Design a protein around this ligand. Structure first.
Ligand SMILES: [K+]
Ligand SMILES: [K+]
Ligand SMILES: [K+]
Ligand SMILES: [K+]
Ligand SMILES: [K+]
Ligand SMILES: [K+]
Ligand SMILES: [K+]
Ligand SMILES: [K+]
Ligand SMILES: [K+]
Ligand SMILES: [K+]
Lengths: 6, 191, 193, 193, 193, 191, 191, 187, 190, 191, 192, 6, 6, 6, 6, 6, 6, 6, 6, 6
């Protein structure tokens, strides 16, 4: 899940 | 289940998909928190730090909760290690699952838009049995846990102790937006 | 199981009795086995009936019981204390827990045990569980402790002893012979022949 | 076994089970869990006693953990409908619907023995709600309606506000006989006399 | 369980009775608990017996039931309608499903409920299940639907209402207080004292 | 089914279940396991028979594997308290508490049929001891007091020393009718 | 199950009896089904009662039993031998094991079987278990052998045969027709 | 037992289909079956954030929260998640099918679709207060699912409220007509 | 426990479990009851074989008592969709959904071994239908739609009139391989 | 399912399950109940790590409710025998034998995480003591020898009076990380 | 029940082992938990293998067992006695019943216990089980008594003690500390 | 319950 | 229980 | 059953 | 049990 | 059983 | 199932 | 099984 | 967990 | 466990 996780 | 290829710069290597995601510093907590599932999380957190102590870690939580002592072992590890442990809720973060979610590095606690959060006071099932003295001792311990949990959640959420005491007396279900408003997470991730 | 039938030869009658109803006629009441609401209430029922037959004659409460429900026991206790007749207690076999409580509750001077009866006292126990929320467990723990305090207090009075003694001596299972129970103050006399 | 006692009548020395014997003195027992069958037996005895004499008090002895709400309501509505005052007396315990019925006695004539325990709480359901959301809403709604009605009637029994009962039944509320009296659930604590 | 004995006075004769047989003498008939072939047939038998005793006096049918077997319920329904005496019906505790149906079937003008009675109506349900060939399931589905239709048609006539109302109001469980059932037309009067 | 039987009476005819009929001749049975209930019934019969006549013998017939110790003691103390001599007779078997009660009959009036079996041994417990060490100690100690008391009482019954009974009840000890007599458990064997 | 009520018209009056109580009045006693402490003691009570009614008239003991408890069977046996009345025995259906023992124990000359009756004899068996220390098992092994030797010895005396005959012929299940049972010496006549 | 296919490299046949960006949801939706799906979706995106992903659903439904985690992942990631119903798509399964990229939701001709309101399997037990809390939450689930389904089907909320009140079975053609899927794949 | 065998390709020496070995010759098995997992595994193999070669026949070996209809339909639709002819062969038995899939093979390429057993019948439900009449009506109606669909699709497989299938599936109908051929359910016996 | 990780190094690289990877850094886990199997596994790891380097510290991570006394002692004796210092660290909980082993770590090197829970008490038995009074006395006496030994060793571990341990283990004694340090059971809390 | 993987170094290579196989290379063999035919035969297999690797080096038999099957225990016992290598025995945790028997059976001088090990010896038990004819019970009682006699005779010899002592001291459960087991003659040394 | 039932 | 009940 | 029992 | 109960 | 009991 | 899935 | 499958 | 374990 | 095993 990026941004931002990653 | 399933087996996935990571072609490194080193060589081509077959991985189960979770080990593949662990390489990107993603750690999963899925299902009930047990001594075994929590300790596996602790091991992955410690391992990711030894690989690189400065890069963020991404803790993905889909859990109804479980054992408090198992959960605290995860919590203290999140707090001890140098890397920021970002938390992300997919599906649900209930009880100890909500606690751990709220414990991510402030600013890096996330939920997906339809994820669900639930918080409440500690309960026991199975029961306390036997001598009054023994029952008193365990009631006293269960009450101590309740005070510690409220105090830490209030600190996690940036809220007053009296709020958490009030809001955990019974099962308290929250939408992602309500969890954000409460101080439980920082952002809701849409795209 | 078969309870024998017994004949009482009145004068206006010859009468058949089941043997326990026959013993009830002489103001003997049994508490045998676990104390339950229904076995306890049956004792209450006999105490009240016997009082109505004669408010002045002693009643003889024979106890062979390992105990049972505290609230069921208290219904016997409060009945024993309320009615005008003196309630003599007699331990045959054993009087444990609430059984021992009720034995010690007989009219002072008239609490008896047979020479080989066993008496045992301890603090409240629960079987089953305390569930589920911390708030509920707190509520039930406090209640259990009040029961504990109250039982120690009342037993202290029955035994004519210090509360601290009962607190000390009921901390774990405390088995007493008939002689130790008399010496302790739980009963008055041990029966001879 | 229930002991059989002898009552002398005009041309009929008859044997009665001891509970039938106390019923002749207008004493009715509620012992153990309240079920449709145990509650209806009570209703029948109440209707019969009114039939025997519509002006004399009836004495309703309660030792019960509670039970079925609707079964209890059939006792409640009978107590209120019939002409005789229904005195209530708590021996052992009156919990949940047992306490409800205890508080429902003719005001001034609601009694507890000194070591009686009373407990009140909000409705519990065991078994569970399945399955379709529409159906669960309907039964949840009905459960909340039962909760408010019971609290409301209790408020009237105790001469208190609904908000008091809502607060005080939220979780298990154990009361000594003295606290139940202070609360308004009963009028007097017996001892002797 | 134990059923108390009471004494009736006659023509200088004296009669021992279990209390339910005693109430049957005043033409009171009970339906308590689930409706089965055996509990329904017992009620039918009593209805038939009461008519033969006196075909002109009202019969008083006391109902505390969650319902049960539909065909068993209909055997009661059809007997109530056949016999000459008016069958007054009275709800104590609850009248649900077949229980409410029978309550609603009482002689119009003589359908009663106690103030805290619970009434519930809904469409037929089956438990255990339909298993087998599609042909057999169709056959049984068709029969269940015929039952649904007939019960609604009959309920509408009992309540003096439009069929569409009953169809709307029995789609899911529909709980009514005594006043709402009276408003609905299911009963005629609420008893107070 | 218990057969019904017409009583020989000086006041008319009365029907009895056959056991109530034998009770009229002051015969009391202990058959099968000793329970609180089976024992209290005996106690009630002994008391009732004394009430009919405090001087006539009572005949206590035992066919029992034993059972509850405290339940047995209630019968024992009733036997010793009441004025009538309580004769004991063993048919079939008297084991454990059964053997104890048999040996407890009035000296001189303890009987056995020729093929009866007597068995004595030390206390057994079933179920188990749980759970705290303090509690097991208390109960172990109580069990040893019981073992010694029973040995002490049996020795007096048998006119032997405590040490004999200790030796002879260490493990299961089966006795023929003749061996039981020689031992002192019963006085006479019936022919 | 329902037991039919029967009317006896005994000169002048009328008395109702259950059908078994009615046959007891003619001195007929049933042992039907497995021999237990309760079923045996019930028989004992009837024999004693019948002796008290008339100590000189024969008693008719009808046996339809697969057997059962050895000690329970022995209490019946000793009562048969003890009481003054001759106890005639009759086998209907079957008499197996302890059932056959009791059948063979009838007053000699008065032991009968119906023509299609089945008789069976064997050595003692145990069901369940002897579990425990070798010391305990030895003890119970010895007790079981004393029983076996006694039973063979008594059966030999009943049948008027040599011990060695009984030892070989009870080694395993030995089924006999009425005629074989008579020929063996186990019964006297076939009805 | 899963067969092994050769591509130099040997694969279990399902990991072999994952390489062609095919992801399966088969059987009941649980935390574990759903999270495995989430992981594969994230992985396929890292391999190529622009190529479509193909989500094959043969499912009777299952956990709602477990279902939402898949849903939120499908919506979050850059690749279009095409959905295809083979066998059946019922309850949460039907929800995920209708949630595929509009224009790229498919069914095989004899597929069955079923939608209904949320149910509880087992019980609500305990104090009335607790039952109210959970009843309230079950109704929120019902309301959200209806609004979201309506948006998936391009219908008014009132249509789904009406049409999920009881078990609602659709053929593939009916699912398409309803707005739940886009095309039926013949061959 | 499944035997390991050696295949010899070119620069090969490949060990295979024996079923993976038969899969390389485009043989796919359906054995035992049809479930979501057993049906989906077949589907995966059909798709895979098509990807290996979209033109060569595939050989679907069926020894099955049947099972889930919806699971069976996922196999059916995959068979009809893919370009390769899916030949079917019954060894042992093909009952219910098993017989349905056997009859669904490419016409001309439906086979049975001489002692195979075929059985067709109407839909059954195992377990029960509870609880409300409205819900029971709904599922009863759905079951009847399945009965009709299956009879119509089966009639098309067998090249027969609908009324025949309706008549012949009312109760369990056991057919020898010859009767199934005669019926139009298979094409040849080996 | 245990994640697979890659050790990069001077070897090239190898694949490890994450726990084997942690074992390489001399970290050993005791998680969950102490059984013969889990305890011996720990023993094997202690012996192996010593053979790898007899001078480097070993890090024993404990999250355990306890379990078998005898199994626990096998770990304890191995900790005390081998040359390396065995540091102990409590995450989640160390209860009973878990706390014993925690307390047994090299003095100066016993750690707990801030929210770890420690509990100590006297020995318990579950299942029960059943059979002969002789046998129950033997087992009671042995349970009491165990109680005495543990109190004495814990007292030595904690540098406290024997009497303190006896009083404080009489019933379940819950301690926070801070109270455990104050008690002398651990040395430092790692925040 | 994961079993850790460890790495061994040696001439021309690097090799991966489950940790118990790793300890087997050093001639350490475990008996842990109940003695069964399968656990006993596994021990027998490891003993025979170690002898074939080197018939003169000691073998180290580590025992933590509550006991178990007598015949299964005898197969280990007879194997210990047969092979050329000395079988040192070591008790960790507990050696009870057949566990204590095997412990006492190590090469004399090389029987060890850790300081808190517990030893227990007693007479043979059969768990509840037995049905049959008096003849069959006699046969099995007799056999159980032969086993009892053999075990006492063999234990006395292991312990260099009088038979009458073993008969006396095994009549009921006999728990020993390590120190007591050494005083009794059952082990040789306690390791500190 | 009278009046009126009965 | 009197007075007063009864 | 007579003669002779009874 | 007299004297004295009863 | 007499003599002598009873 | 292509086109188009895949 | 060929001919013809395969 | 270092410093200091490890 | 050496010395001496091994
Ligand atoms: K951190
Ligand atoms: K009094
Ligand atoms: K009133
Ligand atoms: K009518
Ligand atoms: K005496
Ligand atoms: K005779
Ligand atoms: K997307
Ligand atoms: K095709
Ligand atoms: K060390
Ligand atoms: K050797």
């Amino acid at each position: 899940f990026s941004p931002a996780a990653p | 289940v399933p087996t996935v290829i990571e072609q490194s710069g080193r060589g081509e290597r077959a991985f189960d998909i979770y080990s593949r995601l662990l390489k990107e510093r993603i750690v999963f907590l899925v299902g009930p928190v047990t001594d075994e599932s929590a300790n596996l999380v602790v091991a992955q957190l410690l391992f990711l730090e030894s690989e690189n102590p400065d890069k963020d870690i991404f803790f993905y939580i889909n859990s109804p909760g479980g054992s408090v002592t198992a959960g605290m072992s995860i919590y203290d590890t999140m707090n001890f290690i140098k890397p920021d442990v970002s938390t992300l809720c997919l599906g649900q973060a209930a009880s100890m699952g909500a606690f751990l979610l709220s414990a991510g590095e402030k600013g890096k606690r996330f939920a997906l838009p339809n994820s669900r959060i639930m918080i409440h006071q500690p309960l026991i099932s199975g029961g306390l049995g036997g001598q009054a003295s023994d029952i008193e001792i365990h009631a006293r311990e269960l009450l101590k846990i309740k005070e510690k949990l409220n105090r830490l959640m209030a600190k996690h959420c940036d809220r007053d102790l009296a709020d958490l005491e009030r809001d955990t007396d019974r099962d308290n279900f929250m939408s992602a937006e309500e969890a954000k408003e409460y101080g439980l997470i920082d952002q809701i991730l849409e795209n």
